[PDB]
Symmetry: C5
Subunit: 301 residues, 5 copies
């Protein structure tokens, strides 16, 4: 079966149509070639034969002086935006500016929504983890943090690609003039308006990038603080264990003393209770003294 | 209700007025459009129809050849600066230079105050943490350090944005000439003065950025030193525990020896005390010798 | 023996030949010199006397207006690509574009295959390692991860070299015109087509680089999470050991008490069982109470 | 009281004078304004009205075609350089070159001295710390290392500022011509000589920066090695403790066996010594065997 | 004594001479000044009065249209290269190209030898360290790794300096024309040949830099894997110790039980062996059950 695009077409007045068209007929209707409508790049803004070709992660658009076309919109939850919002936006400047503004605004709003969803989860998870009142931390929250960090990295990459794509155009004047397809098709400055639009969207993307970078550095700092807290708790517990170990060592030493003094043999000392009481008292007082001395030895270190 | 701006207006002589004006009337009074007075960017310096539009994190200003306007100043603690200091500053160069210098000086002073407040707290907290006389560190100080580091990152971002915004203007001569609104409105070089002003403020921002970077690297080094100190204390405590464990092992071994020699059974040796004394002495001397040998074995490792 | 190249030659129609030719004869047949056909660089695209010289890690190609030559193809598993696919590709634009597109597509497909093989292994290994249900992790998987990370770094380097080599050409127009060897040999714009080709391949390489960078940052985050999980498990185990140590300390203390009360000597208290029962009960209840008190002391910390 | 500068003035012949002059009189004597002699920047090289204004961290200089002035030299240990070395240096090229060379050489020598003092201390401290013959490290040396690293970061920042300040001038020819104040005051190429001077000093600064960077990376590597050594020692000590713990466990198990066999009750076995000897031998041999088996179990892991 | 250079001179035909000459006579013989033959920079390529001045870490060369001079070659192991290889290389292009190619090839070969020596040692050391079959790692190998990493950093710095020095020349055409001293001394394109030479050597240096960077990242990854392995072994050993501690706790608890039941007092139960056997069996079975329960409690965690 011949390959076919699923196109939805918007007119200047905002009227909407939708159909399925074979690629060869689409090329013939326009002045393009299969070399152009390939969409091999995730992000791209290009001009060919006075036709603008724009692509996002999952959005594909062709802009003409008299119409707009969105391609392969099925199973992407774009119906609400396509049939409810876009016609209102498209209804003194030419059509190209309206269409480009609509698409760029859609992408920017999508990125802003992603960031707004990501931020509170990460902040709350980090706040919960950093609580120094616990000697251990949950691991489900760690898994959540890892997944959200992956999503944040993807968002940063998308923002950087958007910025680079727009900047590549803003620098050269030739592309700025090319985007003014209506002027060239049928021979106030349009280049200035295009520059303003692209500058605005580039600045918004820069702000988003700065926010994401701040979030990432916050994550790193929280991780370091977590490490430090865990190490401190380890040291405290080891100190406690060491103190108890010294106590047990003294107790066992004088337990051996008593066991030796209490063998099932002849000692020639079983007829006196004074010696027994003296031995018990000596054991106890000496255990106290040696424990205190070992505590002091630990303290001096 | 129609949207309205809360404006405070400064004349050339420094006279001050304040009122509330609807946006449409404000656009009509000037030569601007709603596309300009939107303030969608956190930091922006722009020129439109010989009117300068400046924005900061929370400051919004419009500069004309004959007046200055500050918008949305409510609930921002700007009364002291607005009604006490600015009129004195504004009272041979045209008005634009005075206004721009005032605004930039205000922002720079704000950033300097933030940095001056942040520095001593971080320095003292790090000095307290790094003290090697403790095996553990407080965690409230760690939380304070984390919050102050977040604030420091925000400050660094603000400084970088300021530097980039000014540099974008300093490079191009067209914008430098545009900022000289008085010259164009009613046809010594003004561009040189503007270049001097922007260069001065850019250099001050660069100095602040360098200071912040130095503080951050200091924080990182302190964290590494903290880790090392904690690990060393851990190793010392483990060495102590190991020594005591070897002692206890020897004591328990010869305690088992004595217990076996002292069962409630027949041994055919209960009639001699010499054997008992010899056993006790052997136990004690052997415990000493084996403890010393184990200490040597630990030492060789 | 004189050095010799093993060449396979493709004509315009796609006909294929293969032979071995001495370097001097090859230089004489073309207009080149030994200074050119040296291949001292891993990645290089150059033009000399209207002949294109291209090199990859292990691929060496010479492009002329009428023929293509691949050199040193032995023992490299290139037979399938050389004798089955390339002739079909080479069979209105001149030959140079077809040849360059074929070579660049081959290299890009190779890199994509490498990345596609690497990704799932790393993802699955990291997912297995991060599982917080274990207190330890396998080390064979760690070795696998290390080797795959080394391969990923090599891939990133190759992609960066490819991007730099293409970009060095895209910027200058002189090289773009030079690559159009057919135009100069025998005096629609060819430079535009070359720019389109190189831009497409550069963008594909950029996408691959972004993917690799994302994978690397994911690896780093997973490593940090692994460290945190291990530390938490350590702390939990130490807490358990500390609790048991306090219990054992109490038990040994009152064991010493009982041993002292049960020496093989005279105590003047052996005729009463009430004292014995009271001592046993006191030991048990006191052990419980002291264990609870030590647990509370640990809790307060 | 009116603000006053403390100036020391050098003539062309090297004669030296020193006095205190009010700022207004200084401005009047030269052709400058208070906007220039403010010294709000830590590092700055500027030209105003054929007068060169130079600043360092604590050095302030004004250069004219016929004289040099150093401002605010009190309490800075500059007497030796001011009254002993500089006159000799200043005694065919004009005065500006000599003065600038002297100041830049002074700054470069200061930075070189700082680096030469810092290097050996850090190297020796790291060599002492890295010694793998100890399970712990001193902390006073760590504090010293931290302070010296802070000083190194400050030095790196100073070098970077110096390089940037000189480079900003080297690129533009206009500033190079401006620095030739003598040519313009009273109308072989001077710009070439200035370029040579600035290039020489920039290259020296670059060398210093490279040295500092190498030192910093060395510090980082030493820190990592320290961490690894501490962890290895921890593992060794834990292995020793585990072995001793298994031994103690076996000893205590068979101690319980013997204690149970030696209660103060009736066992119907007290009339035979063969059973007693067999029990003792069984306990000892079994303890040896179980200890060996546990050692093997540890080994297999 | 007057300062003197130790020079070795090569003629066009390759004839070699060597002598010692005072600096003033050397300046007079050429057209240079002491400002040039100072060699204050580690790496430098310069042109003065149609004389090329080149410096490396320890190599100093002066190139003229008719001769080459190497200065200060004593005690540097350059005799083999100076008196055996260089004359052969120097024996249609002018002399400058041959001399520059020889010097650059020498430096590149030196760097390649350094890298080839460094690589296998680091690879083998890392392979030995990463072996997960040991709970500890040797420290002599760590010291070796540290020293080799320092050497690698020095090599990277040298390569970067070489690349920067060559690139500074490649960009400007004026320096490329200046290097063609023979053309200017006594009035096919030489600039093209110089560009080819410098491009070749720059590309080789870039390849070396990439290799060094790959080695460094490999080192870092190996360090991280080492940390992870050590932590895992720590956790395993702690688990073993915890299990043995729980066993010992149960044993000591029921040892206290038996000791209490076996005091040297009156219990009114010494006439029955059934109670004794029941107590022993209860102790043993309960110890088994409590040990199993504690193992389950550890497992659930």
């Amino acid at each position: 079966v011949a390959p076919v695009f699923t196109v939805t077409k918007f007119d200047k007045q905002g009227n909407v149509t939708s159909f399925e068209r074979k690629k060869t007929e689409l090329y013939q209707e326009l002045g393009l070639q299969a070399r152009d409508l390939r969409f091999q790049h995730v992000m791209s803004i290009t001009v060919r034969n006075n036709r603008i070709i724009m692509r996002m992660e999952y959005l594909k658009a062709v802009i003409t002086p008299e119409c707009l076309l969105i391609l392969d919109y099925r199973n992407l939850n774009l119906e609400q935006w396509l049939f409810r919002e876009l016609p209102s936006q498209l209804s003194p400047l030419p059509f190209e500016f309206r269409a480009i503004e609509a698409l760029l605004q859609y992408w920017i709003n999508t990125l802003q929504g992603k960031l707004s969803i990501l931020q509170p989860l990460i902040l709350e998870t980090l706040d919960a983890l950093v609580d120094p009142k616990h000697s251990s931390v949950d691991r489900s929250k760690l898994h959540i943090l890892l997944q959200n960090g992956k999503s944040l990295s993807e968002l940063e990459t998308d923002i950087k690609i958007f910025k680079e794509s727009i900047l590549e155009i803003l620098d050269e004047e030739e592309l700025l003039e090319e985007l003014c397809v209506s002027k060239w098709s049928d021979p106030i400055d349009h280049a200035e308006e295009m520059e303003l639009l692209l500058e605005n969207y580039y600045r918004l993307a820069d702000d988003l990038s700065n926010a994401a970078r701040e979030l990432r550095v916050l994550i790193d700092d929280s991780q370091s603080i977590i490490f430090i807290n865990l190490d401190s708790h380890r040291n405290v517990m080891m100190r406690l264990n060491l103190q108890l170990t010294m106590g047990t060592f003294s107790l066992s030493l004088f337990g051996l003393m008593g066991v030796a003094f209490g063998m099932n043999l002849e000692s020639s000392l079983e007829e006196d209770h004074r010696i027994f009481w003296l031995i018990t008292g000596i054991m106890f007082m000496g255990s106290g003294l040696i424990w205190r001395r070992l505590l002091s030895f630990l303290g001096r270190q």
